[PDB]
Amino acid sequence: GPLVPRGSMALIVLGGVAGLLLFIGLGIFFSVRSRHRRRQAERMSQIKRLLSEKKTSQSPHRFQKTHSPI
């Protein structure tokens, strides 16, 4: 490329980035001031259950074999 900023190409991209940059910078900025208090969210209902159950929903996992006398 040249030592000067070539126009075109980036114009379309920039335009397609501008918006993105918005929602992006907005998506982050938003996820900073507060945790996630949207009317009635914060940490209720989702955490309730989370805690409601010490351990996750039981399931067949089994950690390999690892079981020998010697």
UniProtKB/Swiss-Prot annotation:
* Lipid attachment site numbers (S-palmitoyl cysteine): S31, S34
Q: Which residues carry this modification: Phosphoserine?
A: S45, S52, S68
Q: Spell out the post-translational modification annotation for this entry.
A: Palmitoylation and association with LCK contribute to the enrichment of CD4 in lipid rafts.
Outline the segment boundaries, as ranges, of region: HIV-1 Vpu-susceptibility domain. 39-67
Could you tell me in which tissues this protein is expressed? Highly expressed in T-helper cells. The presence of CD4 is a hallmark of T-helper cells which are specialized in the activation and growth of cytotoxic T-cells, regulation of B cells, or activation of phagocytes. CD4 is also present in other immune cells such as macrophages, dendritic cells or NK cells.
Topology Cytoplasmic: residue spans: 31-70
Location in the cell? Cell membrane
Q: Which domain of life is it from?
A: Eukaryota
Q: What is known of its domains?
A: The Ig-like V-type domain mediates the interaction with MHCII.
Linked disorder reads: Immunodeficiency 79: An autosomal recessive disorder characterized by childhood onset of recurrent and recalcitrant skin warts due to uncontrolled viral infection with human papillomavirus (HPV). Some patients may also have recurrent respiratory infections. Laboratory studies show a complete absence of CD4+ T cells.
Q: Subunit structure, per the record?
A: Forms disulfide-linked homodimers at the cell surface. Interacts with LCK. Interacts with PTK2/FAK1. Binds to P4HB/PDI. Interacts with IL16; this interaction induces a CD4-dependent signaling in lymphocytes. Interacts (via Ig-like V-type domain) with MHCII alpha chain (via alpha-2 domain) and beta chain (via beta-2 domain); this interaction increases the affinity of TCR for peptide-MHCII. CD4 oligomerization via Ig-like C2-type 2 and 3 domains appears to be required for stable binding to MHCII and adhesion between T cells and APCs. Interacts with Aedes aegypti long form salivary protein D7L2.
Q: What does this protein do?
A: Integral membrane glycoprotein that plays an essential role in the immune response and serves multiple functions in responses against both external and internal offenses. In T-cells, functions primarily as a coreceptor for MHC class II molecule:peptide complex. The antigens presented by class II peptides are derived from extracellular proteins while class I peptides are derived from cytosolic proteins. Interacts simultaneously with the T-cell receptor (TCR) and the MHC class II presented by antigen presenting cells (APCs). (Microbial infection) Primary receptor for human immunodeficiency virus-1 (HIV-1). Down-regulated by HIV-1 Vpu. Acts as a receptor for Human Herpes virus 7/HHV-7.
> What name does this protein carry?
T-cell surface glycoprotein CD4
